[PDB]
C-alpha cells in the first residue's frame, strides 16, 4: 500500500507533460497511448492491432449502441475514442488536460468524418463540466493513473453517469508486496510520468464512495505488461540515435520501459462498476 513513495500528481502538470511528449511521442508507440493485449505471451499479433484490442474489450463492457452518449476520460490523441464512435455509432465526448492532445483528437474525428459524433474538449476529470446524468457509460482508458484524487474523480463520474450506466477503467496496482529488486524501475516510471498505484482492496470502498458498485475486477497483468514493454523499449532502442533530434537523450530514457520487464508484483487491472438503476 505505497510501500514505495508516490508522485502525487497534479492534473494541469500532467497536461504540461503530454504537451511535451505527445510530439515524437506518437513516433515511438503510435496512436493508442495504452497497453496492448494478447491471448498468451507468445502471440505474434502486432502491437498496433493488440492495443486496439484493449480498446475493444473496454468498449464492450460499456454496453452501448448507436445513440449512446459516452464519456471518454483522458482522451489521448483521439484514437480509442474515435474508434468507439466509428464502430459503435455511439456519441463520444472526450476530455484531456493537454492542448496538443485535444487538437490531434478533434482532427482524428474530423478526418474520420465523425466530428459531429466524437467531440474532444479540455476539462479536468476532478471537475467535470457536464449536467448530472448525461452519460450512459464512461471509459477511462489508462487515465485514472495520472490523477490527483481517485475518490473524487470517481465521485465526479458517479454524478454524470445515468442510473444503470457503467464505468470501465484501467489502473496500476500492487498484486502483492513489491519485489525489492525492482522498486527502482517502478519508482522511476511512476515518478517520471506522474502516476500512482493503488491497492486492489481500495476500489470497493472507493467506488461505493462515488456511488457505484464494483462489478468486475480483472488482473490483466500477465497479458499486458511484459510483451508491450519488450517491444516499446525495442522500438525505442532501434533508433536511439534519433534522440539526436528528439531530446530523447533526456526524455526517451524516462520512456524506455525495458527496466520494467520482470517486475512481477507490478500490476495492471481492468475494472467495471455500475450505478444502480435503468
Ligand X SMILES: Nc1ncnc2c1ncn2[C@@H]1O[C@H](CSCC[C@H](N)C(=O)O)[C@@H](O)[C@H]1O
Ligand Y SMILES: COC1=C(C)C(=O)C2=C(C1=O)[C@@H](COC(N)=O)[C@@]1(OC)[C@H]3N[C@H]3CN21
Q: Taking CA 29 as the corner, what is the angle to CA 26 and CA 34, rounded to the nearest 5 degrees?
A: 105
Q: How far is the CB of 83 from ligand X (least distance, A)?
A: 9
Residue 250, sorted as left (phi over 0), alpha (psi -120 to 50) or beta, turns out to be: alpha
The size of the interface with a second copy (CB under 8 A), counted in residues, is 19
From residue 225 to residue 264, what is the string marking binding to a second copy with x (rule CB under 8 A)? ---------------------------------------x
Which listed residue (56, 100, 192, 219) binds a second copy by CB under 8 A?
219
| Pairing mode of beta strands 266-274, 213-219 | antiparallel
Residue 195 to residue 171: CA distance in whole angstroms: 10
- State the residue number with the nearest CB to ligand Y: 21
Which listed residue (102, 125, 137, 232) binds ligand Y by CB under 6 A?
232
Q: b or e along 81-113 (b: 16 or more beta carbons within 10 Å of the residue's beta carbon)?
A: bbbbbbebebbbbbbbbbebbbbbbbebbeeee
Q: How far is the CB of 275 from ligand Y (least distance, A)?
A: 25
Residue with cell 490527483: 148
Q: How far is the CB of 117 from a second copy (least distance, A)?
A: 28
Asked if 193 is part of the footprint of ligand Y (rule: CB under 6 A), the reply reads yes
Among 275, 170, 169, 267, which Cα is nearest to 226's? 267
Is 92 annotated to bind a ligand? Reply is no
Tell me if residue 260 falls in helix, strand or coil: helix
Partner touching 219 among ligand Y, a second copy, ligand X, none, CB below 5 to 8 Å by kind: a second copy
Partner touching 202 among ligand Y, ligand X, a second copy, none, CB below 5 to 8 Å by kind: a second copy
Residues that bind ligand Y (CB under 6 A): 18, 21, 25, 29, 33, 35, 142, 145, 193, 228, 232, 255
Amino acid at each position: 500500500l505505497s510501500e514505495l513513495p508516490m508522485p502525487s500528481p497534479a492534473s494541469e502538470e500532467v497536461g504540461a507533460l503530454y504537451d511535451r511528449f505527445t510530439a515524437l511521442g506518437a513516433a515511438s508507440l503510435g496512436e493508442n497511448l495504452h497497453f496492448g493485449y494478447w491471448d498468451s505471451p507468445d502471440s505474434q499479433v502486432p502491437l498496433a492491432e493488440a492495443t486496439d484490442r484493449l480498446t475493444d474489450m473496454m468498449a464492450e463492457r460499456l454496453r452501448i449502441g448507436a445513440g449512446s452518449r459516452v464519456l471518454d476520460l483522458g482522451c489521448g490523441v483521439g484514437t480509442p475514442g474515435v474508434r468507439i464512435a466509428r464502430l459503435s455509432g455511439a456519441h463520444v465526448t472526450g476530455i484531456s488536460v493537454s492542448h496538443e492532445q485535444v487538437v490531434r483528437a478533434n482532427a482524428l474525428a474530423e478526418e474520420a468524418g465523425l466530428a459531429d459524433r466524437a467531440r474532444f474538449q479540455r476539462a479536468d476529470a476532478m471537475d467535470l463540466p457536464f449536467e448530472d446524468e448525461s452519460f450512459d457509460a464512461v471509459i477511462a482508458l489508462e487515465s485514472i493513473i495520472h490523477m490527483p484524487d481517485r475518490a473524487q474523480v470517481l465521485a465526479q463520474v458517479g454524478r454524470v453517469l445515468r442510473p444503470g450506466g457503467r464505468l470501465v477503467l484501467t489502473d496500476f496496482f500492487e498484486r502483492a508486496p513489491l519485489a525489492p529488486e525492482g522498486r527502482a524501475a517502478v519508482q522511476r516510471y511512476l515518478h517520471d510520468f506522474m502516476m500512482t498505484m493503488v491497492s486492489a482492496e481500495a476500489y470497493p470502498p472507493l467506488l461505493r464512495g462515488a456511488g457505484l458498485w464494483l462489478e468486475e475486477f480483472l488482473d490483466i497483468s500477465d497479458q499486458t505488461l511484459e510483451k508491450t514493454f519488450r517491444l516499446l523499449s525495442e522500438r525505442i532502442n532501434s533508433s536511439k540515435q534519433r534522440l539526436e533530434t528528439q531530446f530523447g537523450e533526456e526524455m526517451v530514457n524516462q520512456f524506455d520501459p525495458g527496466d520494467l520487464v520482470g517486475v512481477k508484483e507490478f500490476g495492471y487491472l481492468l475494472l467495471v462498476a455500475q450505478r444502480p438503476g435503468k
